[PDB]
Amino acid sequence: DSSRRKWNKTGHAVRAIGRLSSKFNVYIKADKQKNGIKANFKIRHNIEDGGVQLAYHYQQNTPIGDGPVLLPDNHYLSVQSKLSKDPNEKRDHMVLLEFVTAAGITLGMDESKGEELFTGVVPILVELDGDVNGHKFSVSGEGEGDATYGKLTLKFICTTGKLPVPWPTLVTTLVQCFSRYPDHMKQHDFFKSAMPEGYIQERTIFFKDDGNYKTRAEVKFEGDTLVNRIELKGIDFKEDGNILGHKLEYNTRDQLTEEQIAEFKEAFSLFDKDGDGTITTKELGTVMRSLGQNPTEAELQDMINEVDADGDGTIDFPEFLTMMARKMKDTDSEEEIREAFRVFDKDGNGYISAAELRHVMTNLGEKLTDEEVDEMIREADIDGDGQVNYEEFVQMMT
Ligand SMILES: [Ca+2]
Ligand SMILES: [Ca+2]
Ligand SMILES: [Ca+2]
Ligand SMILES: [Ca+2]
């Protein structure tokens, strides 16, 4: 089991570097000329019997009123969503709990008049009129937002009967003014600064190998209620694809196992060489270099920033756990592991020998004995040739 733990560990570190290089958040930038903002992000929709349907989002927001707004430096929003059902509700519907937090600006230490409209709980009304491939529909929703906690609680109904697209594909269209901006980032909250007059939010959402939604929404106060009024047009969908075919998973209740957390702590340790419970840009750097990469300082800083939910400048184990729960496609993961193979196979002969394995594991800070190295080789060596080929490496690293 201990040669297997060493392979487990190594596979997890290789995958961790890939995930630290991926972009899962909502990336916001200023658009000075338009007195607003742009955003881009990808949503990974789980496909019921396996796989991920990507939805590439592009976004622009512009103020409705004439007053000055806050134009942000580059940052992101991190969103966690739960979709559920009301067992009493006979209409086609969705119950949504969401938490949204601004991050991506590094404080490096542990901890608008519009903003005043958000200091407590605010009631919300949502209205959507859609047309996807000529299928006309309407959604109505109501709830509350509490921007102190970044929290949204809403129930939505399809008021025209059965919803012709899956509910998860509408979540992003169905009030980013309820994001929680940390105290060090209040100057960057464009969304609240545009209130009460509000903003227009426009998106195009490209479902890969399928159709697209284009949306236009007005988000503004009407008296004390924050209202999101939306028109959605979807075109070029496949009648048989994941959207019009209802092939998408509703809720992804999918928490990590105890063994998996156990395995992820061992991977964490391989990064956290000083043992202080944190991974710094330097520690990440050292691991990346022993795996044949040459990241710049700014690239290390960006990688940590992508997962540094608390903005303290380092990755702690909870942050690491969130990151390792990030899905990469079966075939994404794949270039990482190929790269790793080429790094392990020092002479490039297509086999990792025991001497080459030792060399790398040592540089990864496992000091192994002659026997421990042969134990690892034997574990992976399916064809018995005494060395590890690509196909055998894949088996161990996945
Ligand atoms: Ca450390
Ligand atoms: Ca952190
Ligand atoms: Ca070799
Ligand atoms: Ca072999």
Q: Give the Cα separation of 79 and 98 in Å (integer).
A: 7
Q: Which of 236, 177, 234, 174 is nearest to 205 (CA)?
A: 234
Read off φ and ψ for residue 103, nearest 5 degrees: -155, -165
Q: Give the Cα separation of 27 and 176 in Å (integer).
A: 13
Pairing of strands 225-235, 121-132: parallel
Residue pair 28/37 in contact (Cβ under 8 Å)? The answer is yes
Ligand number with the minimum distance to the CA of 307 = 2
Residue 164, preceding peptide bond in cis (omega within 30° of 0):
no
Ligand number with the minimum distance to the CA of 380 = 4
The answer to whether the Cα torsion of 107, 113, 118, 124 is positive or negative is negative
Ligand 4 mean position to 211 CA, how many Å? 45
- The DSSP 8-state label assigned to residue 6 in this structure reads H
- Where does residue 119 rank: exposed (0-12), middle (13-18), buried (19+ CB within 10 A)? exposed
Annotated domain spans of the chain: 1-24+255-398, 25-254
Q: Which of 125, 118, 124, 174 is nearest to 146 (CA)?
A: 118
Pairing of strands 36-46, 52-63: antiparallel
Query: What long-range pairs does 256-265 form, CB within 8 A, spacing at least 24?
Result: 256/321, 256/324, 256/325, 261/321, 263/5, 263/8, 263/9, 263/12, 264/12, 264/317, 264/320, 264/321, 264/324, 265/317
Ligand number with the minimum distance to the CA of 354 = 3
Ligand 3 mean position to 319 CA, how many Å? 36
Q: Give the Cα separation of 195 and 64 in Å (integer).
A: 9
Query: What long-range pairs does 136-144 form, CB within 8 A, spacing at least 24?
Result: 136/160, 137/161, 137/163, 137/164, 139/163, 139/170, 139/174, 141/174, 143/96
Ligand 3 mean position to 341 CA, how many Å? 10
The secondary structure of 264-318 as a DSSP string is HHHHHHHH-TT-SSEE-HHHHHHHHHHTT----HHHHHHHHHHH-TT-SSSEEHH
The secondary structure of 204-223 as a DSSP string is EEEETTS-EEEEEEEEEEET
CA angle 189, 172, 208 (to 5 degrees): 120
Q: Which method was it determined by? A: X-ray
Read off φ and ψ for residue 22, nearest 5 degrees: -90, 165
Break sites following residues in the chain (C–N > 2.5 A)? 111, 174
Please give the distance of CA 383 from its chain centroid, rounded to a whole number. 39
Ligand 2 mean position to 213 CA, how many Å? 35
The answer to whether the Cα torsion of 342, 347, 348, 354 is positive or negative is negative
Ligand 4 mean position to 384 CA, how many Å? 5
Q: Give the Cα separation of 77 and 74 in Å (integer).
A: 11
In sequence order, what are the beta bridge partners of 81?
A: 98
235 C-beta neighbours (distance < 10 Å), count:
12
Residue 191's alpha-carbon distances to 71, 220, 349, in angstroms, are 10, 10, 56
Token pair for 275: 């043992």
- The DSSP 8-state label assigned to residue 396 in this structure reads H
> H or E element: which one contains 106?
none
Q: Which residue has the tokens 């297509």?
A: 350
Token pair for 43: 């949503």
- The DSSP 8-state label assigned to residue 115 in this structure reads G
Ligand 2 mean position to 267 CA, how many Å? 17
Query: Helix (H, G, I), strand (E, B), or coil: what is residue 172?
Result: coil
Q: Which residue has the tokens 């996807």?
A: 132
Contacts of residue 355, defined as CB under 8 A and 6 or more positions apart, other chains included, come to none
Q: Give the Cα separation of 126 and 291 in Å (integer).
A: 49
The topology under which CATH files domain 25-254 is Green Fluorescent Protein (2.40.155)
Ligand 2 mean position to 108 CA, how many Å? 9
Residue pair 36/63 in contact (Cβ under 8 Å)? The answer is yes
Ligand number with the minimum distance to the CA of 286 = 1
Token pair for 305: 């920033």
Query: Helix (H, G, I), strand (E, B), or coil: what is residue 227?
Result: strand
Token pair for 236: 């070029």
List alpha helices for the chain, DSSP H: 2-20, 190-193, 258-271, 281-290, 297-307, 317-324, 333-344, 354-363, 370-380, 390-397
Q: Give the Cα separation of 172 and 197 in Å (integer).
A: 22
Residue pair 328/15 in contact (Cβ under 8 Å)? The answer is yes
Identify residues whose C-beta is under 5 A from ligand 1, the ion: 272, 274, 276, 278
How many helices and strands, by DSSP H and E, does the chain display? 10, 13
The secondary structure of 135-147 as a DSSP string is EEEEEEEEEEEET
Ligand 2 mean position to 323 CA, how many Å? 12
Any idea of the CA torsion for 250, 255, 260, 266, to the nearest 10 degrees?
120
Q: Give the Cα separation of 76 and 104 in Å (integer).
A: 5
Token pair for 382: 């399916």
Domain 1-24+255-398 has CATH 1.10.238.10: yes
Q: Give the Cα separation of 68 and 223 in Å (integer).
A: 21
Residue 278's alpha-carbon distances to 176, 267, 289, 301, 327, in angstroms, are 31, 13, 19, 14, 23
Ligand number with the minimum distance to the CA of 308 = 2
In the chain, % helix, strand, coil (3-state, to 5) comes to: 30, 30, 35
Query: What long-range pairs does 2-6 form, CB within 8 A, spacing at least 24?
Result: 2/372, 2/375, 3/372, 3/375, 3/376, 3/378, 3/379, 4/379, 5/263, 5/266, 6/361, 6/366, 6/368, 6/372, 6/376
Q: Give the Cα separation of 315 and 86 in Å (integer).
A: 37
